[PDB]
Paper text:
Among the 29 viral proteins encoded by the SARS-CoV-2 RNA genome, the 3C-Like protease (3CLPro, otherwise known as main protease) is indispensable for coronavirus replication. SARS-CoV-2 3CLPro features a dyad catalytic center composed of the highly conserved histidine and cysteine residues (H41 and C145), which are responsible for the proteolytic processing of polyprotein precursors pp1a and pp1ab. Here, we designed and examined five new tetrapeptidomimetic anti-SARS-CoV-2 inhibitors targeting the 3C-Like protease (3CLPro), which is highly conserved among coronaviruses and essential for viral replications. The binding pocket of SARS-CoV-2 3CLPro can be subdivided into four sub-pockets (S1–S4).
We adopted a tetrapeptidomimetic scheme for the inhibitor design (denoted as tetrapeptidomimetic compounds, or TPM), similar to the backbone of 13b. Compared to 13b, the (S)-γ-lactam ring at P1 position was expanded to the (S)-δ-lactam ring for better steric fitting with the S1 pocket (H163, E166, and H172). The P1 (S)-δ-lactam ring formed hydrogen bond networks with the H163, E166, and H172 residues, while the P2 isopropyl group formed van der Waals contacts with M49 or M164. More importantly, the P3 groups penetrated into the S3/S4 groove as intended. Interestingly, the relative orders of the binding energies (TPM 10 > 1 > 5 > 16 > 19) was not the best predictor of the inhibitory activities (TPM 5 > 10 > 16 > 1 > 19). As the initial screen, TPM16 and TPM19 reduced the RNA loads of SARS-CoV-2 replicon by magnitudes of 103 (relative level to the control experiment using DMSO), comparable to the effect of remdesivir, a viral RNA polymerase inhibitor. Thus, a balance of in vitro and ex vivo effects for TPM16 (IC50 = 0.16 μM, EC50 = 2.82 μM) likely reflect a balance between binding modes, impacts on the H41 conformations, and solvation. As evaluated by computational methods, PF-07321332 induced similar kinetic features compared to TPM16, one of the best lead compounds found in the current study, suggesting the reliability of using simulated ΔGbind, RMSF, and solvation energies to guide drug discovery.
Numbering used by the authors:
A (entry chain A), B (entry chain B): 1 to 303
């Protein structure tokens, strides 16, 4: 028993982290085979933060402008290119620690582990969800760029996030590993706003099932609702619409607990309209939406 | 900026996990140099559970009754001994991945990272605190015994916890790596109940400082209190007494924010007496007590 915000074991990714310096700017790089991936804004100066044209800063760079350090071993850069908002630095050594890996782009509402690093050295690991507005609520300080997000399936690391920036609201924005930003953000010093966020309804339901599996039952009731009547309540509270595919995805948790999805929806509607009246669910006084149905099944395997 | 429950990178410990089987019972072991450490209840059977004489059970075992597997490689057990509630299995191979390490026993109120494992294979990593009643609120299923808790300083792994059991309340109990239980628990079958828990006051104050560092300021006030008057309120709400050493430990966070410790205590008193009136702090509607002052400093480093 127990339910915790759990990250994937980070060992396979730790072996991929290097330090990339260009000018007086240092950040993190991801070393896979003979390529190091890093945010392209490593080539920017104090003087070009509002109007940066990145082909040219790049055209004006040479291979020797990039110092790549793996531990205390210097890697020789033998080629450089831009891929959207990331740089690909070809180095003269394939990383012997390269895991089996994939570059996947994730969907809002999906979760991943972040390995926070500074100067190529990992600091900590934690779980994040991609918000409906394509930001993430992380923990990132100056020097955290090149910190990657990932999932692991058996021995294959699916990289999904590279960190680039913090917004004025304190939330975080980045790219997939092809260098394409999540959301309407750009790698400039512009104060940018994300759109309005919403709550990931299917995840809240999954976490309620986690609660039941773990013995928290006080919020259950006889009642059931229709999908239509639930979604009318959901939109009033800034919750995302629940689709039939969401209902289907919750099937296995529904079967394990014997609580029909639309029954659990009736509990959620009451929680939304009444609050908790001083009680907690799995140690929380708020409704939690950063656990996917997969996250619950993986962790609550067998109770 | 940002504040998350963050675990240490788990790579160094992943390289130490093995699978230990004796009879029909499989659990995890910790392989350091030429010794594998595991819970001694691996040698118990279905019908000796309520009070095994472990020491009778061990004299009846031989080296070949213990099968140890590191990945896909069987390790030969060449010796076995009991140290309190753990077993030391001497193997014929020193683990080439052994980090610099220490066996430390932690205090209630301190935190550590848990690498949850099954069949010698790591599943996830998360942060735990040792409760004042010597339990931990973890996520542990059947097969997770022998999973370890640890902190990392520089590149030295300080192991502090090995998992043994779940209490009827759903919380978890284990030993240090010398096999001595945290708290009044035994690796046998009784009606084991935790003693009454309390909230870790110094940690709540540390987390309030993290909140300020991260721009959550609504709970601040212009009052200050005396340590005596605060501790009278703390005792009323099941909070641990705040000592002058606690105030001293909070010094650096006090200086960084310019909020004197006893001023922050005045905010905490009002939070305890009024609640939050529907507001949140660092995304929480409850007062969080599983971040130490060190956890905050290390993460809210330089704003
Ligand atoms: C890379 O390591 C770094 C990480 C972020 C910086 C520190 C805070 N948390 C982080 O994750 N990424 C950047 O520095 C990035 C470089 C750009 C994309 C070229 N910039 C930022 O993240 C933010 C964007 C921003 C700009 C203006 C307002 C609000 C957000 N830049 C800053 O935070 C700097 C703000 C600043 C500096 C000096 C004086 C006043 C304000
Ligand atoms: C080792 O892997 C295992 C992990 C725990 C078991 C599964 C639940 N979560 C865990 O962390 N540790 C044990 O199995 C341990 C072995 C003892 C110490 C020799 N036992 C337990 O953790 C609990 C103790 C307990 C016993 C009775 C009531 C409450 C708690 N044992 C059980 O959970 C088994 C309960 C049970 C089994 C079969 C029928 C009815 C109840």
């Amino acid at each position: 028993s127990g339910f915790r915000k759990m990250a994937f074991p980070s060992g396979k990714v730790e072996g991929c982290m290097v330090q990339v310096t260009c000018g007086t700017t240092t950040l993190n790089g991801l070393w896979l085979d003979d390529v190091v991936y890093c945010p392209r804004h490593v080539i920017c100066t104090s003087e070009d933060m509002l109007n940066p044209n990145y082909e040219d800063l790049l055209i004006r760079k040479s291979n020797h402008n990039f110092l790549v350090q793996a531990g205390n071993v210097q890697l020789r850069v033998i080629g450089h290119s831009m891929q959207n908002c990331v740089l690909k630095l070809k180095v003269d050594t394939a990383n012997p620690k390269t895991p089996k890996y994939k570059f996947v782009r994730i969907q809002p509402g999906q979760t991943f582990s972040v390995l926070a690093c500074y100067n190529g050295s990992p600091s900590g690991v934690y779980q994040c969800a991609m918000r409906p507005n394509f930001t993430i609520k992380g923990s990132f300080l100056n020097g955290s760029c090149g910190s990657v997000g990932f999932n692991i399936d058996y021995d294959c690391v699916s990289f999904c996030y590279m960190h680039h920036m913090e917004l004025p609201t304190g939330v975080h924005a980045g790219t997939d590993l092809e260098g394409n930003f999540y959301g309407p953000f750009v790698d400039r010093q512009t104060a940018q706003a994300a759109g309005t966020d919403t709550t990931i309804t299917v995840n809240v339901l999954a976490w309620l099932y986690a609660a039941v599996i773990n013995g928290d039952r006080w919020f259950l009731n006889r009642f059931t609702t229709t999908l239509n009547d639930f979604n009318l309540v959901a939109m009033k509270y800034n919750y995302e619409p629940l689709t039939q595919d969401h209902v289907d995805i919750l099937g296995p948790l529904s079967a394990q607990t014997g609580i029909a999805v639309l029954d659990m929806c009736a509990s959620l509607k009451e929680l939304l309209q009444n609050g908790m009246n001083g009680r907690t669910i799995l140690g929380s006084a708020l409704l939690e939406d950063e656990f996917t149905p997969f996250d619950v099944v993986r962790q609550c395997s067998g109770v």
